[PDB]
Amino acid sequence: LESLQAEIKMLSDRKRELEHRLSATLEENDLLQGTVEEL
Amino acid sequence: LESLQAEIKMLSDRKRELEHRLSATLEENDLLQGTVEEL
């Protein structure tokens, strides 16, 4: 059961990395949108 | 183990909730980027 919990934690870390990447993409696209709004 | 495995699974579910909400926001932002390209 401990091995299963560790695997779940590893998957949670992978999901955290994915969420961070999505937040970074959102921030970059929002910066592009802000420049577009200035234009 | 019964008190920790369920917590870890719920944490993974919340990570999936964040991933789903952020990816939905990213797709909606891509659609809004198509609209902004029309603009």
Curated annotation (Swiss-Prot), chains A, B:
Q: Where in the cell is it found?
A: Cytoplasm, Cytoskeleton; Cytoplasm, Cytoskeleton, Microtubule organizing center, Centrosome
The record's tissue-specificity note reads: Highly expressed during early embryonic development. Predominantly expressed in kidney, undifferentiated neural tissue and developing eye.
Q: Which family does it belong to?
A: Belongs to the BICDR family.
> What does the UniProt function comment say about this protein?
Acts as an adapter protein linking the dynein motor complex to various cargos and converts dynein from a non-processive to a highly processive motor in the presence of dynactin. Facilitates the interaction between dynein and dynactin and activates dynein processivity (the ability to move along a microtubule for a long distance without falling off the track). Predominantly recruits 2 dyneins, which increases both the force and speed of the microtubule motor. Component of secretory vesicle machinery in developing neurons that acts as a regulator of neurite outgrowth.
Quaternary structure (record)? Part of a tripartite complex with dynein and dynactin, acts an adapter linking the dynein motor complex and dynactin. Interacts with KIF1C. Interacts with RAB6A and RAB6B; interaction is specific to Rab6.
Protein name listed in UniProt: BICD family-like cargo adapter 1
What is the organism field in this record?
Mus musculus (Mouse)
